[PDB]
């Protein structure tokens, strides 16, 4: 899901990549913890 | 949402509501899209034909419309056998 | 009978199954041939 | 070539600490908690 509007609802995750062993997970539009949105966040990212 | 009354019937060994139709949407299909909400809108007119079919021949079992978008609108209304995450057991049912 | 049609011999692994993974069950129809429901002569084949 | 007496010290320190760790930890990190009755390691989201 490539858009904040599509990333709603639930989806399945497969443990160890086994298609017969899945769990439900609510999908959420997440932001990276170190990003480049302003010069302060960009400077923090470049510091790391 | 609608909170039905769910009398218990024969010919379905489960509690059933003859007042409206129930809708199933696959677990990983968001209910709230503009493709899904545009289907729950025009499929809302099947309910009075479901009722008419059922009252002309009361011997009639499930009547279902299975959509090319994943929806399944069936009559009479009855709770699905498997809620996805309300209990632990998830359901994998696609009408397609 | 209301049971599904079986194919082969079932084989389960107990060392590779998580407790709470919700395995899929089945989706197939109960297609039982007429010659597999009764005993099979050569007159029953021609009646069929 | 001036870095030769430093390499002969790093080699010997690595050899000393390897033998200390071989004496203290040999065959200790071989248990883990699997699922009861299974051969799947039981971990958490980001835990290794």
Contact between chain B and chain D (3 or more Cβ pairs less than 8 Å apart)? no
Q: Which two tokens stand for residue C27?
A: 């989706």
Q: Are D35 and C15 an interchain contact pair (Cβ–Cβ within 8 Å)?
A: no
Asked if B90 has any chain A CB less than 8 Å from its own CB, the reply is: yes
Q: Residue A6, SS3?
A: coil
Quickly list DSSP for B47-82. HHHHHHHHHH-TT---EEEE-TTS-EEEESB---S-
Which among B7, B3, B30, B31 has a CA at the least distance from the CA of B18? B7
Residue B4: exposure state from Cβ atoms within 10 A (0-12, 13-18, ≥19): middle
Dist CA B27 CA B83 (whole Å) = 9
Q: Are B90 and A8 an interchain contact pair (Cβ–Cβ within 8 Å)?
A: no
Q: Which residue of B has its CA nearest to A12?
A: B28
| Strands, sheet with B22-24, edge to edge from the N-terminal-most edge strand | B22-24, B72-75, B63-66
Sequence-distant (6+) residues with CB within 8 A of A45 are: A34, A35, A36
Sequence-distant (6+) residues with CB within 8 A of A6 are: B30
- CA distances for A30 relative to A9, A27, A33, angstroms: 14, 9, 9
Q: Which of A10, A12, A23, A27 to mutate to test the interface with B (most CBs of B within 10 A)?
A: A10
Q: Are D39 and C17 an interchain contact pair (Cβ–Cβ within 8 Å)?
A: no
The total number of residues shown for chain D amounts to 48
Dist CA D39 CA D33 (whole Å) = 10
What is the 8-class DSSP label of residue D2?
T
Dist CA B62 CA B9 (whole Å) = 13
What are A22's strand-pairing partners? A14
What is the 8-class DSSP label of residue D21?
H
Q: Which of D39, D42, D43 to mutate to test the interface with C (most CBs of C within 10 A)?
A: D39
Dist CA A20 CA A13 (whole Å) = 11
Quickly list DSSP for A32-44. -SS--SSHHHHHH
Dist CA D28 CA C36 (whole Å) = 60
What is the 8-class DSSP label of residue A17?
G
Sequence-distant (6+) residues with CB within 8 A of C25 are: none
In the block, residue with structure tokens 């599509």? A6
Q: Which residues of B touch C (CB under 8 A)?
A: 88-90, 92
Asked if B32 has any chain A CB less than 8 Å from its own CB, the reply is: yes
Q: Are B92 and C20 an interchain contact pair (Cβ–Cβ within 8 Å)?
A: no
Dist CA A9 CA A38 (whole Å) = 30
Dist CA B34 CA C21 (whole Å) = 32
Against chain B, the chains showing at least 3 CB pairs within 8 Å are A, C
Rounded to 5 degrees, φ, ψ at A11 are -150, 175
The sign of the torsion formed by the CA atoms of B72, B76, B81, B82 equals positive
Distance, C-alpha B26 to centroid of its chain: 12
| Helix (H), strand (E), coil (C) string for chain C | CCCCCCCCCCCCCCCCCCCCCCCCCCCCCCCCCHHHCCCCCCHHHHHC
What is the 8-class DSSP label of residue A12?
E
Dist CA C46 CA D14 (whole Å) = 85
């Amino acid at each position: 899901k490539m858009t904040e509007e599509e990333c709603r609802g639930y989806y399945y995750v497969y443990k160890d990549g086994d298609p017969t062993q899945m769990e439900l997970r609510p999908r959420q539009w997440i932001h990276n913890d170190f990003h480049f949105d302003n010069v302060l966040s960009a400077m923090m990212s470049l510091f790391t | 949402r609608i909170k039905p009354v769910f009398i218990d019937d024969a010919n379905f060994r489960r509690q059933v509501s003859y007042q409206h139709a129930a809708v199933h949407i696959p677990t990983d299909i968001y209910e709230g899209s503009t493709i899904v909400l545009n289907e729950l809108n025009w499929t809302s007119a099947l309910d009075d034909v479901f009722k008419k079919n059922r009252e002309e021949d009361p011997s009639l079992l499930w009547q279902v419309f299975g959509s090319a978008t994943g929806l399944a609108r069936y009559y009479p209304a009855s709770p699905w056998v498997d809620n996805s995450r309300t209990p632990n057991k998830i359901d994998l049912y696609d009408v397609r | 009978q209301p049971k599904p049609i079986g194919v082969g011999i079932p084989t389960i692994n107990l060392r590779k199954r998580r407790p709470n993974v919700q395995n899929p069950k089945s989706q197939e129809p109960v297609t039982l041939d007429f010659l597999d429901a009764e005993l099979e002569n050569d007159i029953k084949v021609e009646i069929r | 070539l001036p870095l030769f007496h430093i390499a002969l010290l790093v080699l010997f320190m690595v050899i000393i600490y390897a033998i200390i760790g071989l004496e203290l930890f040999k065959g200790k990190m071989h248990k883990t908690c699997y699922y009861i009755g299974t051969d799947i390691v039981a971990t958490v989201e980001n835990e290794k």
